């Protein structure tokens, strides 16, 4: 029974591969050759935020394009003001191993969680003048690796037990769960329509998840090593992807193909974070070699270097209005580049 | 600080700075230790004696005014690669091992070999523990199960002259105990090139003095680190 049950599986995925192969006519580069190159960006370090004790693990830009939130492993979650370099709030923590932060689109709640297998919800704007935990969410076996806000009452969490789970704060239980990943998923990104989201586990594959019905829709492969960072495209019909083999790739939802690959042999370290630009011409990509290069999105030619970090770069983020980019590192120093 | 609002904002920032520097002063004089190991090993007993799917069961203890943090692992998955690089500021690793099973020994050696060769877990010393000595002694007295059943190399082995047996202790027990000890130490000395040092120990829980052992091991570890930093070693 097992021998025959599989044979149709190989036949069907072979048919899928044949359909995928016989669906391409050209790559992006040969069609984009007739484009004026991008030119040197020459970014400068406008600011340098500091005050963290241990090494930063994540950061997230507020919707107002003025506030940002950072979480480090010393058990602290500070909220800065990116223009005047002040400190709005400084929230302590219960678990000293936090690797996730998320600032709500409205600007009310902050969520963070790590090896404790719990996402906490903090209520910034209260009648009280103190930030207090709202509702701890439990139900994941492994460590939580990413978390995003669909709405003000619908958080989405990506865990280490190979199961993603859509939550509901007012009720307080998983209204939907996702299965289909062998490895532990370590990346989560939301579509601009908030109707879909993709994720990438350690088995070198990414899958598209339909939020409403609550199950997968598409699968994406093409990487050798695990996946450390994923991010959509501003149009919403593409998404970049990071890995550990010094290669970051661009994928297509509509065509279900592998369009373009970004790689240069002078770098052997791994991509740690990927973020796009509000226009889509650039593709930022941090590296373990202490460097944060800038990749052109249409020609694969490097368009400048943003060195200046004394240790590993862990997280990036482009501004919502698109005027600045912030990189966090393991040397406990946030830098507001521009 | 042009207006009054910015003055109040920088006042609030100054208060936050004072709180953060106080927390840094509290944070800078504490030593953090992992507690890797296994299941049949007496993690629960020892962690209670120092005195829900949560993945961290952190415990604190104090000896001679020094502060140690016991980051005991919890109900995670068997895979141990993506949350191990997070531990690079720790001082040592207490690798508890059970030595009264005769069959989990090989898996324990495999686990120790995996821990002693991780790229991230380099320049981190290991404080190995042996546990359940009384059970091993009783098994030696009982007979039946033998090391030769699983490890045939025990017979062609003699106790080292460096052994320091306690009163009693039929020297067959000593031969076996030092057999496991030498196995773990040869696994440790297989690599390392003098950048992190193993530290074997012979405990049995049941309120035997252990915090002193971690204290002495950490003192030696930090002293050797400082001596190496100043080109004195």
């Amino acid at each position, epitope marked *: 029974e097992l021998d025959q049950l599989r044979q149709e599986a190989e036949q069907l995925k072979n048919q899928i591969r044949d359909a995928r192969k016989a669906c391409a006519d050209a790559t992006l580069s040969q069609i984009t050759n007739n484009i004026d190159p991008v030119g040197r960006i020459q970014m400068r370090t406008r600011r340098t935020l500091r005050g963290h004790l241990a090494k930063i693990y994540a950061m997230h830009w507020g919707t107002d394009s*003025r*506030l940002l939130v950072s979480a480090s492993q010393d058990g602290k979650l500070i909220i800065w*003001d990116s223009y005047t370099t*002040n400190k*709005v*709030h400084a929230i302590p923590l219960r678990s000293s191993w936090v690797m996730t932060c998320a600032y709500a689109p409205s*600007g009310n709640y902050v969520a963070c969680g790590g090896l404790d297998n719990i996402c906490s919800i903090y209520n910034l704007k209260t*009648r*009280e*003048g*103190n930030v207090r935990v709202s509702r701890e969410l439990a139900g994941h076996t492994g460590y939580l690796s990413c978390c995003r806000f669909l709405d003000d009452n619908q958080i989405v969490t990506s865990s280490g037990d190979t199961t993603c789970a859509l939550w509901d704060i007012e009720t307080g239980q998983q209204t939907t769960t996702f299965t289909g990943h062998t490895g532990d998923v370590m990346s989560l990104s939301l579509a601009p329509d908030t109707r879909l989201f993709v994720s990438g586990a350690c088995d070198a594959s990414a899958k598209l998840w339909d939020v409403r019905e609550g199950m997968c829709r598409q699968t994406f492969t093409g990487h050798e090593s695990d996946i450390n960072a994923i991010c959509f495209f501003p149009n919403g019909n593409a998404f970049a992807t990071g890995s550990d083999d010094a290669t970051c790739r661009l994928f297509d939802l509509r065509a279900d193909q592998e369009l373009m690959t970004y790689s240069h042999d002078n770098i052997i370290c791994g991509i740690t974070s990927v973020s796009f630009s509000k226009s889509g011409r650039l593709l930022l990509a941090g590296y373990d070699d202490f460097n944060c290069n800038v990749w052109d999105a249409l020609k694969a030619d490097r368009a400048g270097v943003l060195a200046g970090h004394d240790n590993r770069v862990s997280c990036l983020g482009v501004t919502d209005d698109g005027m600045a980019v912030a990189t966090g590192s393991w040397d406990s120093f946030l830098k507001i580049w521009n | 600080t*042009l*207006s*009054a*609002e910015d*003055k*109040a*904002a920088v*006042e*609030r920032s*100054k*208060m936050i700075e004072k709180q953060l520097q106080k927390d840094k002063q509290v944070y800078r004089a504490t030593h953090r230790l992992l507690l890797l190991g296994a299941d049949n090993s007496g993690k629960s007993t020892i962690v209670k004696q120092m005195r829900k799917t949560s993945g961290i069961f952190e415990t604190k203890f104090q000896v001679d005014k020094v502060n140690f943090h016991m980051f005991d692992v919890g109900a995670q998955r068997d895979e141990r690669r993506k949350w191990i690089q997070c531990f690079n500021d720790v001082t040592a690793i207490i690798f508890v091992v059970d030595s009264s099973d005769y069959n989990r020994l090989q898996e324990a050696l495999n686990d120790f070999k995996s821990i002693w060769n991780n790229r991230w877990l380099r320049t981190i010393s290991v404080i190995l523990f042996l546990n359940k000595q009384d059970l091993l002694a009783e098994k030696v007295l009982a007979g039946k199960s033998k090391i030769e059943d699983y490890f045939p190399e025990f017979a062609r082995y003699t106790t080292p002259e460096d052994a320091t047996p306690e009163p009693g202790e039929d020297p067959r027990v000593t031969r076996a105990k030092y057999f496991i000890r030498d196995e773990f130490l040869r696994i440790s000395t297989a690599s390392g090139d003098g950048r992190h040092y193993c530290y074997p120990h012979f405990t049995c829980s049941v309120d035997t003095e252990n915090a002193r052992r971690i204290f002495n091991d950490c003192r030696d570890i930090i002293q050797r680190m400082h001596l190496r930093q100043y080109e004195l070693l």
Partner: single-chain antibody
Amino acid sequence: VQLVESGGGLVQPGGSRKLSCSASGFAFSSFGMHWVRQAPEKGLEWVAYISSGSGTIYYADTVKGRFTISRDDPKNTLFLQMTSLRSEDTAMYYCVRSIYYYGSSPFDFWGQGTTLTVSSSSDIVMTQATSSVPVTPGESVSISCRSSKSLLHSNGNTYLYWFLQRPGQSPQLLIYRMSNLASGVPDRFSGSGSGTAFTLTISRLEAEDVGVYYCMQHLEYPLTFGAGTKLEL
């Protein structure tokens, strides 16, 4: 949350008294504290201001070296001591809560107040065009506020507060920064201006709108107040 005060009464001139505004139900150690002065037959006036960390201390230009303030963080109590009281120093005194950071809404909460009876320049000046107008429940009501200087700041913030105290209770907040709505007010009030004169508009009028409106400015230490426009239906 609630603010309670003790004291009051009639005091002969030249004496001294100690009154307190006790706070219970919030974090008293993270809120700036203010004091206001309002005669029973006149408008509102500023008294003092104390920062959260007691590092910045401001006083009214009228009284600078005579009045004194003090706060007690463990008990969440705040004290005022009066020295050489005068007959003119007879008005309503309120203790006002405020917290300062980006996006905050200062002067949000108000206390109950106490009654004190005594037996018998180059700063920005502001005025109100009118003092009493007749309106009807269902038409539009417009009130104008005018200042003597352009309040627009380099950052881009125009500082304007409206309170609209009702006849019988402490005042509230409707609009801050000339454009931002308050917390629990209905979606019926708005403000606009060009940099010199400000106007307030109300869409619908109900029985809850009966009261006197106050116009406020917050640019420098003096913290000037308005005159007031009573509304009769």
